[PDB]
Amino acid sequence: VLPQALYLSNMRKAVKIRERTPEDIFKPTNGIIHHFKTMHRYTLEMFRTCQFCPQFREIIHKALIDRNIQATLESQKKLNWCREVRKLVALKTNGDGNCLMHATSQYMWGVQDTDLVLRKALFSTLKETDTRNFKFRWQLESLKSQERNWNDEWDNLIKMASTDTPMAGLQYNSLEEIHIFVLCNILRRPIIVISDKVGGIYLPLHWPAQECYRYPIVLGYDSHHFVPLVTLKDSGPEIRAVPLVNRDRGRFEDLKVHFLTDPENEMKEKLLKEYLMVIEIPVQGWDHGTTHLINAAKLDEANLPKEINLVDDYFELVQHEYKKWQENSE
């Protein structure tokens, strides 16, 4: 029937991307952060599954989405809770300790950084470029949550970003919050994360917003595993956006925006307003038949060209396999 993963519906294509990928990275002599030239502006959007037999609509899902963390985050009212906005879906991602990059790489490209290009770009940027500012905010935030051995623990982190094997669980080193903050600064693109320590909003602070992509990358996190929370190519009318807040027992705790400087945390709403794309959204709340306005960031509408577009493929191949399934599922 239908392939186990979005990209395996056209591997000659996957390759095309996995090759276009590194050619896009600009490595400034200026000593500025290694960043992507253009491919960061790309956003994948999943196809409309609500068009098929419930029996068939179902076989696609076992195939593509990670129903485990999907059910979890949704259960914890932390994933698909706002009714006024489009639903998001968790794509399955290799849990080889590079999940962070895999999930990011999927969200943008259809593919999945099996070539280690992102993971590399992280490490290379973290070794050959000025750690100065990262090290700082890393300290700064490690203090805010301590209720003495500095440069020592940070040397450890740069080490973990390495492509090489861990001297302990599985095949690559597990990444941590700071790497995300760096990753997003390599992408020049925000990354908001939906979880149950890392969940929050990461912004390309080492860049004037006047020059990075203002649509997020959305990831889901559970049991130390990273996933792309991609938007359904729904018909409407639900706005395409992520709430910048959560629902915590009747109040709206907004998201933890990370690695902010002490002056910055005092003007976040203004930062978020400009690195993101913020809109005020009406939300049934307070249960008391009342309403409540929350902030949400506009999400991107799929813009992967034909030439590199694995979904378009997997879909065709789904429609074919459905004509044959419809003709004679008996």
Swiss-Prot record:
It comes from the Eukaryota. Changing C212Y: In AIFBL1; increases inflammatory cytokine secretion; increases NF-kappaB signaling. Changing D66A: Minor effect on 'Lys-48' deubiquitinase activity. Strongly reduced 'Lys-63' deubiquitinase activity. Changing C99S: Loss of 'Lys-63' deubiquitinating activity. Down-regulation of TNF-induced NF-kappa-B activity less effective. Residues 88-232 form the OTU domain. It is found in: Cytoplasm. Residues 54-269 are annotated as: TRAF-binding. The active site is at D96, C99 (nucleophile), H225 (proton acceptor). Residues 174-176 are annotated as: Interaction with ubiquitin. Changing H225A: Loss of deubiquitinase activity. Changing H102A: Reduces deubiquitinase activity. Changing C99A: Loss of deubiquitinase activity. This is A20p50. It comes from Homo sapiens (Human). The gene is TNFAIP3.
